[PDB]
Amino acid sequence: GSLTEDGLSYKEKFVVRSYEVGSNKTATVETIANLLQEVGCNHAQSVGFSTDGFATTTTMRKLHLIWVTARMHIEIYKYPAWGDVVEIETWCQSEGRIGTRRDWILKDSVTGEVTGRATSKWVMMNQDTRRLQKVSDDVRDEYLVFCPQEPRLAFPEENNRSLKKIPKLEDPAQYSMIGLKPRRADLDMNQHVNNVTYIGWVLESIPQEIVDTHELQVITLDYRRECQQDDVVDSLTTTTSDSQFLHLLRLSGDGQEINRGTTLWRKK
């Protein structure tokens, strides 16, 4: 892993592991998402951000602020096979006072061909009160020294999938997976549920026949509220159509929304 020549992006290579692949002998979308998180953490560490689970700046630590994901959007053209080397390039950009964006490009190391891309929106939050905040001018200055000044987007197209509004699934759902609970392997070093665990929970309500005959092309996921270590989740899915689905994760009891999303699947 290393910062590129100009120091405004980071690259890292990964050899796809035996336990990281699904029935097709290629990396799962959850393996891909963990690799994106890993290269994001290595980029933050390389530019001097805190190494205590929260990649905060000096001003964020002074005001007890943390970055939290609001949206994850991933598009895969080719999933790497077991033993293949995938190269991932990541960079960050400020989006005024709204928040920040982290983008990724995935490539086949042998051919140099782009096999996937991802983008994520992050918002400022006070870690004590859990109240969302706008980005201050001081933290905007700290981010600017490590981000490209001219816009660089993994998804540049005007009016693209990564920016589409997601509706709320209405009961009854076509499919559901009930009583999903996180175990210790689903938590991060700060004992919060890993962002990738939610992708797995969304996918749990897709019928096995869809997973067996189709490959996942796009996933867009909104994060609304965190699932606590002792919470229980229900994963709901309805076909909206290629095959397209609308998704909802909500707490098992009162039905409080935690995530909403969409997936696009191509026939194998």
Contact string (CB under 8 A) for a copy of itself, positions 199-218, x = contact: -xx-xx------x-------
Distance CA 106, CA 118 (A): 8
Q: Distance between CA atoms of 76 and 31, rounded to whole angstroms? A: 12
What is the rounded CA–CA span in Å between residue 156 and residue 103?
Answer: 11
Give the per-residue contact string, 155-194, with a copy of itself (x = CB under 8 A; - = no): ------------------------xxx-xxx-xxxxx--x
Contact (Cβ atoms closer than 8 angstroms) between residue 224 and residue 258? yes
- Residue 41 catalytic? no
H-helix or E-strand containing 73?
A: strand 65-76
Is residue 129 within the footprint of a copy of itself (CB under 8 A)?
no
Q: Which of residues 9-68 bind ligand A1BMW (CB under 6 A)?
A: 33, 36-37, 40-41, 44, 55, 67
Nearer to ligand A1BMW, 161 or 213 (CB): 161
227 and 233 in contact (C-beta within 8 Å)?
A: yes
Residue nearest ligand A1BMW by beta-carbon distance? 40
Positive or negative torsion for Cα 218, 185, 260, 104: negative
Q: To the nearest whole angstrom, how small is the minimum distance from the Cβ of residue 67 to ligand A1BMW?
A: 5
Q: How far is the CB of 175 from a copy of itself (least distance, A)?
A: 14
- Toward a copy of itself, which CB reaches closer, 162 or 205? 205
**Residue 92 appears among annotated catalytic residues:** no
Mapped onto helix, strand or coil, the DSSP state of residue 185 is helix
Angle at which helix 29-46 crosses helix 195-203, to 10 degrees, equals 170
Question: Catalytic residue among 34, 43, 73, 192, which?
Answer: 192
Beta strands in 111-174 (DSSP E): 114-126, 132-133
The distance between the two most distant Cα atoms of the chain, rounded to a whole number of Å, is 53
265 binds a copy of itself (CB under 8 A): no
Reported as type and span, the H/E element at residue 247 is strand 243-251
Answer yes or no: 64 catalytic: no
Tell me which residues touch a copy of itself (CB under 8 A). 17-19, 21-25, 28, 30, 34, 37-38, 41-42, 45, 51-53, 82-83, 179-181, 183-185, 187-191, 194, 196, 200-201, 203-204, 211
Q: Where on the chain is the footprint of ligand A1BMW (CB under 6 A)?
A: 33, 36-37, 40-41, 44, 55, 67, 72, 102, 120, 195-196
Residues assigned a catalytic role = 190, 192, 227
